[PDB]
RNA sequence: GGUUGCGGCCAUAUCUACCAGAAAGCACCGUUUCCCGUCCGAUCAACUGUAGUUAAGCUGGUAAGAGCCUGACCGAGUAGUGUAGUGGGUGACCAUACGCGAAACUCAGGUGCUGCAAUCU
RNA sequence: GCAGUCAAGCGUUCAUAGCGACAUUGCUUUUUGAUUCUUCGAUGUCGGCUCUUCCUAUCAUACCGAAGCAGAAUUCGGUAA
RNA sequence: GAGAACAGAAAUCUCCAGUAGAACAAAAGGGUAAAAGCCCCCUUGAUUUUGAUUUUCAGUGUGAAUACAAACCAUGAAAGU
RNA sequence: AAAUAUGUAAGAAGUCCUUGUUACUUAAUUGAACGUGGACAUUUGAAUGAAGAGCUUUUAGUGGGCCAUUUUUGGUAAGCAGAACUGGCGAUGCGGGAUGAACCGAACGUAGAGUUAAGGUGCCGGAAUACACGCUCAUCAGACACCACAAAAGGUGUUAGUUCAUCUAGACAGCCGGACGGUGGCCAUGGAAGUCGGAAUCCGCUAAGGAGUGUGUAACAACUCACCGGCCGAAUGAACUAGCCCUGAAAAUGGAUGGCGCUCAAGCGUGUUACCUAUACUCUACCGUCAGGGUUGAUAUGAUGCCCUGACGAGUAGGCAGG
RNA sequence: GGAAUACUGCCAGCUGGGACUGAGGACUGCGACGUAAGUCAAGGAUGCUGGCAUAAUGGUUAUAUGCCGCCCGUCUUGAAACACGGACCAAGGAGUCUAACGUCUAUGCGAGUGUUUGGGUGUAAAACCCAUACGCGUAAUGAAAGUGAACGUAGGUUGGGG
RNA sequence: GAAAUUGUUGAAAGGGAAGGGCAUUUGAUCAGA
């Protein structure tokens, strides 16, 4: 017998492959597994890790977010890498010329980038151009802006968006939400 | 029925330190507490205002707020299986500066001075405290100290 | 606790700046090994003087061999032991060739006759009785008579085999 | 040391040998029914299995740990022969969180060469003479998995103190015999 | 029928299963209960310090 | 070094009984128009510093003094206690091992130290 | 409920022939309680009648010891179911 | 405790000692002596706004309490409260 | 005023120096808080460890507990009832305690070998009718903790001790002699002379004799002993202490150190070895799991593949996964 | 006075007997011996020989023997229980579907998204095509009237993968 | 044309159940080379 100081047979808790059955995503995962194994590039390692992520862990990255990242000082000529979907954003009116590598481009985002004069390329094209992730800039979308997130941690004095189907007066606003009816939260 | 009041079971805890009753001496009010100071909590039974709860007697915390006659103290209270942050508003009579950190600040000053003098003299640091080491070899002389032989004594009552 | 050896143990009551070179107390301990000897030394020192192992140190431990291990001697042994209901001082006499053999006999006899375990016994003193007629126990006196002879009746020989064919005899 | 003892005796003094700087501790009690504080101390000394042994550098801080776990371990002062045989036969290094046998000096050099330890005898030296990098060398050494003693424990009952005719506690010099029989 | 009233048995084991976690000390702790007059002045002090630092970039 | 004002620690400073105190200071002390307060100029208030005194306050000293304070290989490694055993004992309880370790008791020593400011034989 | 230990006293004298205060040590499970472990998809709930066996803390019978046992009667006790 | 007409054990007056052995609404515990007790003077902070905190605690509620902020006040010579 | 338990600290979110902001604060750049810039990286400021650390969501079962050591309340107590800390059983097999939920040992993938734990080694039954010093004889012996009971009080049973005494200037025991006088001492009583009772506790002769140790008398008288002697000639006496054994010790079907049986034990106390054997420990193989890695540089179709390395494996309720 | 021996400990001293294991499968490594060739006990067994070539080994099965083994399910702190169900066997026999939802995951598109109420069409309940709306989202807050999200490089500081 | 249950035949075992686990003997039977 052994006085175990930790749980036995504990799985790492991290994805080692995509849950997706997408054959093209599996091919990309194979390519970047080879790259992360035989290039020693931290970019390649993090891209391989990101290729496994679920949909909520790959929030969309908007072209406006990409434009701000390019407005970062010294990053104007870097290849923007998004392991996920790049979405269009009409709230921005001046998009710069840049090369963006992404899993997916929406029609509007691809049109905006190409019209501004850049190119939308796949992750394998990115791997061919920069096998060590040279001059890359990895962008991630907002994870905690999801609708599900605001209901997380709900409780007294948390301000955490009660789970509710109908909103308005008469819907969870009277007792426990104001001092005039019992107490406030 | 049962009784769990605010000052329950404080009978001896909040006593006045026999033959030290009466007015609080002025050094207690002349102490100065700044945010980040480390203070031990010991309630004064003669000062009923700004009093800590009995749980915080003997607890050491960090001052986070300073007011006219009180300080705010941060205590990590064990609740269930984790520690919760607690903010006590304690009049200065119930707190004093913790000497567990004035000595540490003196040690920090001494370490900085020793590092400066070492960088001036040569190459040696030895700046970490070490536990009590096993004793080195020694020679014990018998000159004037011839070993005296003891034996266990016989039993007797002497009552 | 086992076959016994005698040790001299000298301890110091560790020195300080105020009192260097403390009084170097010594005892003679009967123990089966040096660890037990030092443990017993500190036990008795805690019984005698204001000191403990943490505040003292063993200056020396030396095995004391019998000076004449092949000379038959009579030993007077003064012991103090705890019975089931009290503490008692006793004097006994043991004939043997060494102090360690006499002490082993003493422990065996105390266990056999008073159910006194090792933990319950203090060896106050062991001293050779140099002169006959200073022996005051009959069970030792009877072995000090001139030209002592005695037979060994009813000799029981151990058989190596399960069965014997002879109906053996106990002559000696 | 021998000549210092002789010289003190000739001068009429007593040579008090330096207190031992190294102990070897072996867990002699199973993993059931252990109070939480001694259990934690055993885990921190890496004795998580019966007949698991480790070297401990003697200070007040570790002497108190040995005091806390006295009823569950047999410990003492290991000799150079005991240490050499332990490292030679049951010497394993912790490399990438793995138990790798010390079958080559390159294995020791790759993990401890930054401390000046280049060989199995370098490691043995760092253990026997408690050097500046004793902590790193000892932690590199995987806990020694000894067998039950070949000639038995020498006592009918293990779980009283060595002084009381048992097996646990400080058995200062007899730990060499016990560990050699266990090796 | 009467039953058990109370016991703390097994409670420390349950708590230590997931451990007694220290509460994640942060830099820049909250100013929740800090004296509001001090907080009002500190807001302006931080405003002025940021202004001075930005203006120092020439 | 004395003394005063303000103090810090709050008896090593307190308490009982005696003795002494140069200089200054403090004090008692002298007076009742005014401010003020009293049954009562006793206290409190105001005035003089003059009429007098160290009697008391105060300060220091004395006492095989009470108390208090300090230390002790004094008691005592005692009481107690953490840990251990398929130890003892019918039990009550006790012993031993690895550790921690009092209080009373006894003995000896001590009896305010000190900060700022001012003043003084 | 039954049995001891001590022995102030009772017993004309005499603590213990027979008793025995104040105390104290026990045993038993034929009292009654205490508890709620078993049984509530059910162990037939008083007593008597009948019949067998067991225990001994022995009423009688056998043989004995002691007595404040002259005899007679009786009492205490032993081995004994 | 020592004294003073009626006046004594207890009306009132005076001095001495008095670490609280009294009192502070109530139960008990704690606390308090130029006070937290007694007497006197002035008063309404037992007010307004809404937050933070402690105990119970799920770190919900309620009760109770603590320290501030913004006012308006009370008292005091004032610091303050 | 402990022991145990318990809060905090042992640094880079630090320390030191200079000076920026503010409506706060101060008599006042005085301070407060937050900073710019500069200096300090071998021990960055104790030990030990760290199948990594931190974090989030969502759901199952559960919400009758019980036992052991220790602390502890009610109760006479309880296999009772209620708390504290821990370890356990529930949920757990395995070796041992004959047997048993909880005790001891040890926790469990499938096997091999070795060594052990607790417990044992006369036979059942694997293993010394081992060694060694003692103790015990029971016409109810005793024979391993939890645990399956026994007490006060006793015993020239036997053993070992403590203390005080007597003794070759003759100890104790044994047989025989004496055991007086003052004196029926005084008093209570109808009578009480040494002896139903109170006080006085004396001497002469004395080796020695008590105003009395008992028997006896209505009181006497009379035997008797303390006390001293004759004979023998060396150890003896008293009160205690605690070991084993015995008495105390009585229940119901016939029966339980587990049984047999065991007596310089096969019992009790103790010590030394040798030996036996757990699913424990050590080494190896194989299965699976987990982890860390190698390998699309081709034929080479199994990169979810092949391969290398290390560690691990108990399980009710329950969850998940692969089939 | 000079030794010896015991006891304890050490040797990278030598050597005999016994048992279990032989994993791996070109080479690569670390070594040793040798001047060097090479050889080796050095990153896991080979060499030589015999018998048999089938029920001989082995499997299965019945029985015998040694030791072990209480009746499952269930409620329960505790079941083999003198607790409950069960004489036996076959077949049937119990977390389903639906409306609306939380988390997580996959997929499509993405500031939008949802063709299928309906229309068109059809090889006819299929597949294929489609307008206007509507639902949810893109704005919140307030009881409501109502108002309604850039001082700044959509801010500053600390940490932060890349 | 199953099982429970049953007849006959054949084989085997059988001192107050039977059934099971490990291991091998014996009998029967059989695969692989
Ligand atoms: K019933
Ligand atoms: Mg395992
Ligand atoms: Mg106190
Ligand atoms: Mg109040
Ligand atoms: Mg062996
Ligand atoms: Mg053993
Ligand atoms: Mg309950
Ligand atoms: Mg006057
Ligand atoms: Mg005045
Ligand atoms: Mg005078
Ligand atoms: Mg005095
Ligand atoms: Mg134990
Ligand atoms: Mg019925
Ligand atoms: Mg019936
Ligand atoms: Mg009878
Ligand atoms: Mg006042
Ligand atoms: Mg329930
Ligand atoms: Mg109950
Ligand atoms: Mg259950
Ligand atoms: Mg278990
Ligand atoms: Mg038993
Ligand atoms: Mg195995
Ligand atoms: Mg046998
Ligand atoms: Mg007795
Ligand atoms: Mg036996
Ligand atoms: Mg024996
Ligand atoms: Mg893998
Ligand atoms: Mg499992
Ligand atoms: Mg030898
Ligand atoms: Mg092979
Ligand atoms: Mg065969
Ligand atoms: Mg059986
Ligand atoms: Mg029940
Ligand atoms: Mg069952
Ligand atoms: Mg039953
Ligand atoms: Mg039922
Ligand atoms: Mg039925
Ligand atoms: Mg069916
Ligand atoms: Mg048909
Ligand atoms: Mg059929
Ligand atoms: Mg029959």
mmCIF file of C-alpha atoms (C1' of nucleotides) and ligand atoms in Angstrom, chain G residues 37-39, chain I residues 64, chain J residues 76-79, ligand 33:
data_model
loop_
_atom_site.group_PDB
_atom_site.id
_atom_site.type_symbol
_atom_site.label_atom_id
_atom_site.label_comp_id
_atom_site.label_asym_id
_atom_site.label_seq_id
_atom_site.Cartn_x
_atom_site.Cartn_y
_atom_site.Cartn_z
ATOM 1 C "C1'" C G 37 -30.207 -4.394 20.290
ATOM 2 C "C1'" U G 38 -33.746 -8.644 17.911
ATOM 3 C "C1'" U G 39 -38.915 -9.424 16.353
ATOM 4 C "C1'" G I 64 -30.952 7.410 10.121
ATOM 5 C "C1'" U J 76 -30.196 -1.380 7.632
ATOM 6 C "C1'" U J 77 -25.067 1.238 12.152
ATOM 7 C "C1'" G J 78 -25.157 -3.852 11.839
ATOM 8 C "C1'" A J 79 -27.993 -10.139 7.865
HETATM 9 MG MG1 LIG L 33 -32.788 -2.152 13.294
#
